Amino acid sequence: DNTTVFTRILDRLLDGYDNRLRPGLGERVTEVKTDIFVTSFGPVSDHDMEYTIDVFFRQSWKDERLKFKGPMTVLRLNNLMASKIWTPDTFFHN
Amino acid sequence: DNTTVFTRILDRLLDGYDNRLRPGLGERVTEVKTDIFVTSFGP
Amino acid sequence: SNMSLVKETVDRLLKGYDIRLRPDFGGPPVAVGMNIDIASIDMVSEVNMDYTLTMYFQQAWRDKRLSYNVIPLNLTLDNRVADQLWVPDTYFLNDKKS
Numbered sequence: 001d002n003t004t005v006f007t008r009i010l011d012r013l014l015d016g017y018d019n020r021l022r023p024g025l026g027e028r029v030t031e032v033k034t035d036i037f038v039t040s041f042g043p044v045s046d047h048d049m050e051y052t053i054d055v056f057f058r059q060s061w062k063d064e065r066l067k068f069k070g071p072m073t074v075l076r077l078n079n080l081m082a083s084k085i086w087t088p089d090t091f092f093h094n
Numbered sequence: 095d096n097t098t099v100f101t102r103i104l105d106r107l108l109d110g111y112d113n114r115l116r117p118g119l120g121e122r123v124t125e126v127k128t129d130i131f132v133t134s135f136g137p
Numbered sequence: 138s139n140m141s142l143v144k145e146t147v148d149r150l151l152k153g154y155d156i157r158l159r160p161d162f163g164g165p166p167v168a169v170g171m172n173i174d175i176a177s178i179d180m181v182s183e184v185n186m187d188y189t190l191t192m193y194f195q196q197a198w199r200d201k202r203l204s205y206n207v208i209p210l211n212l213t214l215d216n217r218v219a220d221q222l223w224v225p226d227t228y229f230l231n232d233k234k235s
């Protein structure tokens with residue numbers, strides 16, 4: 001019945017979590033380690049002077065408010081948990 | 095207070111209603127009567 | 138009544154259900170069987186190097202938490218309860234607009 005213990009872990013993680021505050025708000029500068037995997041370089045539209053590109057945009061920061069201790073090492077969670085934590089607001093300048 | 099009695103009716107109507115089960119789930123077959131009124135037959 | 142029995146069964150199933158965790162979250166992988174019933178392949182464009190296809194994409198897995206042994210019928214629920222179950226994160230790698 002690992003479902004109950006993992007639910008308890010998740011509810012302890014989100015218990016007392018504020019997703020409006022970056023990790024290390026007072027005494028640290030957050031370090032976002034990015035990465036890109038271009039799955040397909042799309043067609044360069046010459047008329048619009050644009051170009052399309054399909055990417056696997058990866059980011060990785062260190063959040064100390066999401067430390068746990070359970071049977072598993074890495075929690076491969078669902079994509080809906082990513083909306084309850086703080087995630088950097090990377091936008092493409094062009 | 096006519097809005098109040100109608101609110102009471104509408105609240106009693108959805109009290110204990112499960113919108114995940116069709117009417118007569120195991121006891122009957124639902125009979126949907128359909129109709130179509132073509133306002134414009136497009137290009 | 139049978140309707141109240143089914144409602145009680147479904148409410149019991151969805152109570153205490155964690156959508157964040159796949160079936161067997163700490164054990165072996167879950168097996169997801171795929172079916173496709175291709176309705177049509179609409180347009181095969183040489184200028185965009187794409188093609189549009191409409192399909193009936195069906196997946197079938199085994200969730201032990203959605204197991205009931207009170208009613209003997211195969212329940213068919215409204216399509217809005219899928220927002221409260223776990224469904225696999227399947228995506229088409231070479232799609233552009235779907």
Ligand SMILES: *[C@@H]1O[C@H](CO)[C@@H](O[C@@H]2O[C@H](CO)[C@@H](O[C@@H]3O[C@H](CO)[C@@H](O)[C@H](O)[C@@H]3O)[C@H](O)[C@H]2NC(C)=O)[C@H](O)[C@H]1NC(C)=O
Binds near residue numbers: 220221
């Ligand atoms: C992208 O796909 C996801 C998942 O397929 C969509 O998430 C779904 O969004 C709808 C509408 O926001 C959610 O329904 C809502 O449920 C709440 C109850 O939490 C209810 O109060 C609202 O009235 C509405 O019915 C649905 O739960 C949600 N599903 C999941 C699994 O999160 C999302 O909308 C899609 N986005 C786009 C732009 O297509």
Ligand SMILES: *[C@@H]1O[C@H](CO)[C@@H](O)[C@H](O)[C@H]1NC(C)=O
Binds near residue numbers: 209210211
């Ligand atoms: C439920 O589906 C299975 C497989 O399609 C079938 O063998 C079984 O008879 C169905 N149950 C009922 C009550 O029809």
